[PDB]
Design a protein around this ligand. Structure first.
Ligand SMILES: Nc1nc2c(ncn2[C@H]2C[C@H](O)[C@@H](COP(=O)(O)OP(=O)(O)OP(=O)(O)O)O2)c(=O)[nH]1
Ligand SMILES: [Ca+2]
Ligand SMILES: [Ca+2]
Length: 429
DNA sequence: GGGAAGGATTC
DNA sequence: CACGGAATCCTTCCC
């Protein structure tokens, strides 16, 4: 029942929160209309100019289009919710939802039929489902399960990569080669008993089967010539199901055709909004608009879009280049009191230091985040070559940054509700 | 072009 | 009664 938005937007009223969603959507539109004009002034000359450019570049990509690797994406249904649930009954029926009363991490399948969805505040959730059993997290209980499943994976693709505890990619290309002539042996697994062929389609039934047994919990996966496509298929037959996209061009193109752009990673709330006002809704519409986009978005975005439109995506899963940053933030009831604030700041660098020195990193860039009670987020940050890594060392800089703030502006309180500290820029590449 | 601020996205 | 936390990449400027 779509009146479900009636309940929410209603209880959301005009809270010091909502007031920021507008002071945001309004800033968005500005970005959109600011773009519209840009368009309205592109001579057809320029457009045929870029068309040729992009057309040429695309023809290049299309050539170097690789359709050999066979990528998989696994995203075991619910999970956080499915674990706290299936692995602690009484909730085999009942609609739960992992998270607090102020934030929901995951939702119970039966809780979604009511509107409760991930990233939905705690209270809202219940004022939409009083049956709300907001079960508190247990990251440890899952970790033990992740490694429990990450275990089965290495069996098909040793050199793989897991994005989180919820999903993971794997170029089962090396395996399917060998699994060619693996007759009978470790292809038939014990429940009685069943076998699995040589098809990629298959080894993906065998992994949802093994995960099935070794955890009771279900999964879901997609199979495609690349990371991107794969990730989109997985969530196709979402509730315990898998979808493939044979390795020929045409199949990809047909799967991309009417695909709503929002349904891919990297494209979200705002990018979708922005392109809509441009008439773009589906990947096809995104390919025929390749020219305009060329003169409207960073050499990246449009370069990016053009891949999505062509259905191109990474083919070799690579080990994430060490790390980029590390931070800590805390949300809370107002904390105006200047002397008080410093206290929490220092206590952060502290947590950060432990966290940091626990992987033996030593960064040379400290950043602090300050979010008002009206959510007016702000981020001041300093950088040095001191290559810092200690609680004190860090607090030195931060203690200062948070000081330059209180000063410069606000001869009166600094009504905070969120503060964070991030340490970045530190390796020797 | 090297960046600092502040977004945008995804789990 | 109260809209998380992290990590990474992108966008809008500057000196
Ligand atoms: N928004 C948000 N999601 C989170 C967070 N922590 C875990 N998640 C989960 C919620 C989603 O179930 C999950 C993956 O996104 P989807 O929208 O793809 O859900 P998922 O793939 O788990 O499908 P399922 O939940 O299995 O139907 O990320 C969080 O902190 N914020
Ligand atoms: Ca999942
Ligand atoms: Ca997913």
């Amino acid at each position: 029942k779509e009146k479900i938005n009636k309940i929410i937007m209603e209880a959301t009223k005009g809270s010091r929160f909502y007031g920021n969603e507008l002071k945001k959507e309004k800033q968005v539109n500005q970005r959109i209309e600011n773009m519209m004009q840009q368009k309205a002034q592109i001579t057809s000359q320029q457009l045929r100019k870029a068309q040729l450019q992009v057309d040429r570049f695309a023809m290049e990509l299309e050539q170097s289009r690789n359709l050999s690797n066979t990528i998989v994406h696994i995203d075991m249904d619910a999970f956080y919710a499915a674990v706290e649930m299936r692995d602690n009954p009484e909730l085999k029926d009942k609609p739960i939802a992992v998270g607090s009363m102020s934030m929901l991490s995951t939702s119970n399948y039966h809780a979604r039929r009511f509107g409760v969805r991930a990233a939905m505040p705690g209270f809202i959730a219940k004022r939409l489902c009083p049956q709300l059993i907001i079960v508190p997290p247990n990251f440890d209980k899952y970790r033990a399960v992740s490694k429990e499943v990450k275990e089965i994976l290495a069996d098909y693709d040793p050199n793989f990569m897991a994005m989180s505890l919820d999903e993971a990619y794997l170029n089962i290309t090396k395996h399917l080669e060998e699994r060619q002539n693996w007759p009978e042996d470790k292809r038939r697994y014990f429940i009685n008993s069943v076998v699995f062929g040589t098809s990629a389609q298959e080894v993906v039934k065998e992994i949802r089967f093994r995960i099935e047994q070794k955890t009771t919990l279900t999964a879901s996966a997609g199979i495609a010539p690349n990371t991107m496509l794969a990730k989109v298929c997985s969530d196709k037959n979402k509730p315990n199901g898998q979808y493939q996209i044979l390795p020929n061009r045409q199949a990809v193109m047909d799967f991309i055709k009417d695909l709503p752009i929002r349904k891919v990673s990297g494209i979200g709330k705002v990018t979708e909004k922005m392109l809509k006002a441009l008439g773009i809704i589906t990947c096809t519409e995104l390919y025929q608009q390749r020219a305009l986009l060329s003169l409207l978005f960073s050499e990246t975005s449009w370069h990016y879009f053009l891949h999505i439109s062509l259905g191109l995506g990474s083919t070799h899963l690579t080990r994430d280049g060490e790390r980029k940053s590390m931070s800590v933030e805390r949300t809370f009831s107002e904390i105006n009191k200047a002397e008080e604030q410093y206290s929490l700041c220092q206590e952060l660098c502290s947590e950060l230091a432990q966290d940091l020195q626990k992987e033996r990193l030593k960064g040379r860039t400290v950043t602090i985040k300050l979010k008002n009670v009206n959510f007016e987020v702000k981020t001041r940050a300093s950088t040095v070559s001191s290559v810092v890594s200690t609680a004190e060392e860090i607090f030195a800089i931060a203690k200062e940054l948070l000081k330059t703030e209180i000063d410069a502006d606000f001869p009166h309180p600094l009504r905070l509700r969120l503060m964070g500290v991030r340490i970045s820029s530190f390796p020797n590449e």
